[PDB]
Structure 1
């Protein structure tokens, strides 16, 4: 708020002002990979990749 001095104060009334801040989002973050079905005979690398992605 403003503060004002004196007795008269005539024609010197102020208004109200409240400011704002905006919160937004970003883009999604991804781990994205492709595997052929022959690569899933042993799936250990696939699981370890999931853990690395986390």
Structure 2
């Protein structure tokens, strides 16, 4: 806020100004992964890939 000192302030009134900033999100950070129906008879590699990806 500005400030002026004195008694008589005719026509010296100030305006209102408020600035702002912009925020945004970028691209997703993916992890693709593909398996056939063979590789889900054990599931341990699948689980470990999930945890390591996180």
TM-score normalised to structure 1 length:
0.69
- My pick for the range that moved more, 27-36 or 5-14, is 5-14
Structure 2 residues not aligned, in runs of 5+: none
Cα distance per residue 1:1-54 (max 9 Å; x no partner):
101123332222111112222332222222211112222232211111111112
Q: Give 1:39's aligned residue.
A: 39
Structure 2 distance, partners of 1:43, 1:13, is: 73
Structure 1 residues not aligned, in runs of 5+: none
Aligned length: 54
- Taking only aligned residues, the RMSD between alpha carbons, in angstroms, comes to 1.8
